[PDB]
């Protein structure tokens, strides 16, 4: 057994930004009080991971990235009762302490114990469980999944169906985010018209969400036409490539939808796309949701007049879902209510992790995952 | 008596921007098809009226301003069935045609036949019913109330209780806007904490609104402490003057509401104050509503991060109310559910109209109204 013992395993470390991830042999210490050590079965590669490497999203280095995964509990530390060794779980980059204002609230999931603000890259006691070449390695949002074993706080684990498929790892971020953006944040209504900007893992998940919600028209907007067939198959009623157009994408959309769509979901993070998304909505009531993050300190030059006639601009993290709702998502997935696995376009090993980033960089596929 | 005849009367004409209004003798033509001529009984002076004069809000000149009033129908044009001579009414700067997209949707009141975008300053047939010193005079948003008699489209009039008090004119704009911003736009929930920035006609109405919505805490924010007493009397649980602190107002508010308020309403149109309002709301789910217009081409330097955690930024006109709901507001006022008259701090006659602009220009009291 490995309980109470340090584990040496493989992991993809980011020693510095703008550089390919380095595969290293690392040491994972045993879990401390209210911590759980998890054996990762599968991990996904998110755009967010790429953004940390590019320094778009602030982070300390060296660091082990990844926050989209499914695994099984290897051992638990003192005080843990929410899970036991052998339980299949999904790590939560947005924890659920259950006692903060956000957790007590029914309209928020932004638990105040998240590390997205402080960015300590360390456990609660300010120490690291990861060691490589005598050096402490920082974690990502209390998770880090680009490693065979990881340690997370017990308030950041979601127990799920023992038989859940490995593709279920997308529910750990990409799918919950896009799907939730349409169903929880925007709150797409039956018969409504929607537009999704950015056709990556999140965008496709948002398309699946708009369809689940009953939208009559779902417009996928992106610049990689090779993805359009896929988008249609998953629910989009049509796709638009802004590069084919000379006139603004939002004028094109408004002209095709009697003034604009009812709901727009921006999944690129670019200021331009955010602006295009907003103006693509009906001025009298359109709702726009932003999910991505722009560079360090870029700003959206917003004309208050665009909101005055009736528009709403919203944002959310993890699709607005609470950790206690992840299991329900896995259940629906296994009951075929949502085909998450349809979004997995590539399966790799941890050794090929850099290939996944290459696929993103280029801008193709849907979502690659790694099987450990 | 006057049906089918031109009426000679008094009106306050703005011959050009940045100058006091001129009291003139004008001629008002009889109503054409689907138009209604109204004898104004009382009119309020709104900040918006001041904005047109200072060119903050675009408009043609010469123009007769004013869009907050109550009057009685003097005569009707061919085909009018909704009202008859003698009916007490309130002109609507946001009409209700009943046929466009916004009118067919319950989630929008922005009737496409509004003149806020085209700014023609003319009737449906592109002619004016106002004549002064031999010149055709433009109107304001299909209304114009700084005149003893006016002509509006039959889709821009709301019949109300025959015994409605003169102070009912505030429902024409100021009151409906603020009260609605709280009840319909922000959708304030019982027990929540609210923040209202800008203590003018709209600001006070917003306070009354949060109170009626069941808020447990209502913070009034403005740099004129002489109004705080009134604010408290009408519903505010406390008031803050940004000039009594060295740190940003949003920090003082978050520091006092453990994270920020649930709902913030900006009633000034200043970019500065709009940003402060947004940051005064809880990051996990705060809702900010903007109601004012900044200079024609000012932009809000919005950082996406401020919304990503769960905040919403919304806007609306006429407080989200439909013309068909105006009569109900008047009923509640006469039943004493809402004391609109408490916002009236000055009563003048048409000749003193420039004094009301003076009071606003210096933020003296709440709202002034003229009795014709
Ligand atoms: Zn992510
Ligand atoms: Zn919490
Ligand atoms: Zn007004
Ligand atoms: Zn209409």
From Swiss-Prot, chains A, B:
Zn(2+) 1 binds at residues 46, 67, 173. One of its GO terms (biological process) is retinol metabolic process. Pfam families: ADH_N (PF08240), ADH_zinc_N (PF00107). Its EC number is 1.1.1.2. One of its GO terms (cellular component) is cytosol. GO terms for molecular function: alcohol dehydrogenase (NADP+) activity; all-trans-retinol dehydrogenase (NAD+) activity; zinc ion binding. It comes from the Eukaryota. The modification N-acetylcysteine is found at residue 1. Its cofactor is Zn(2+). InterPro entries: ADH-like_C (IPR013149), ADH-like_N (IPR013154), ADH_Zn_CS (IPR002328), GroES-like_sf (IPR011032), NAD(P)-bd_dom_sf (IPR036291). Belongs to the zinc-containing alcohol dehydrogenase family. Class-IV subfamily. This is NADP-dependent alcohol dehydrogenase. It comes from Pelophylax perezi. The lineage of its organism: Eukaryota, Metazoa, Chordata, Craniata, Vertebrata.
């Amino acid at each position: 057994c490995t309980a109470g013992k340090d584990i040496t395993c493989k992991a993809a470390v980011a020693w510095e930004p703008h550089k390919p991830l380095s595969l290293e042999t690392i040491t994972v210490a045993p879990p401390k009080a209210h911590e759980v050590r998890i054996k990762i079965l599968a991990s996904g590669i998110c755009g967010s991971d790429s953004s940390v490497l590019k320094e778009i999203i602030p982070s300390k280095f060296p660091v082990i990235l990844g926050h989209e995964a499914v695994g099984v509990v290897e051992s638990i530390g003192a005080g843990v009762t929410c899970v036991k060794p052998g339980d299949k779980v999904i790590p939560l980059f947005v924890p659920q302490c259950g006692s903060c204002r956000a957790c007590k609230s029914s309209n928020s999931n932004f638990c105040e114990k998240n590390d997205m603000g402080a960015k300590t890259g360390l456990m609660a006691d300010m120490t690291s469980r990861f060691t490589c070449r005598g050096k402490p390695i920082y974690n990502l949002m209390g998770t880090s999944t680009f490693t065979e074993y990881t340690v997370v706080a017990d308030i950041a684990v979601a127990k799920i169906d023992p038989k859940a498929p490995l593709e279920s790892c997308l529910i750990g971020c990409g799918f919950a985010t896009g799907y939730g953006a349409a169903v929880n944040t925007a709150k797409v209504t039956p018969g409504s018209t929607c537009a999704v900007f950015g056709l990556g893992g999140v965008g496709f998940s948002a398309i699946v969400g708009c369809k689940a919600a009953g939208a009559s028209r779902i417009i996928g907007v992106g610049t990689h036409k090779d993805k359009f067939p896929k988008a249609i198959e998953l629910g989009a009623t049509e796709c638009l490539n802004p590069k084919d157009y000379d006139k603004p994408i939002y004028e094109v959309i408004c002209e095709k939808t009697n003034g604009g769509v009812d709901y727009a979901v921006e999944c690129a993070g670019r200021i331009e796309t955010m602006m295009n998304a907003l103006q693509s909505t009906y001025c009298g009531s359109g709702v726009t949701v932003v999910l991505g993050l722009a560079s360090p300190n870029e700003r959206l030059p917003l004309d208050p007049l665009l909101l005055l006639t009736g528009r709403s601009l919203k944002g959310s993290v993890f699709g607005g879902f609470k950790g206690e709702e992840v299991s329900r998502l896995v259940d629906d997935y296994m009951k075929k209510k949502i085909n998450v696995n349809f979004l997995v376009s590539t399966k790799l090993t941890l050794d090929q992790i850099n290939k996944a980033f290459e696929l993103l960089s280029s801008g193709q596929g849907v979502r690659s995952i790694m099987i450990y």
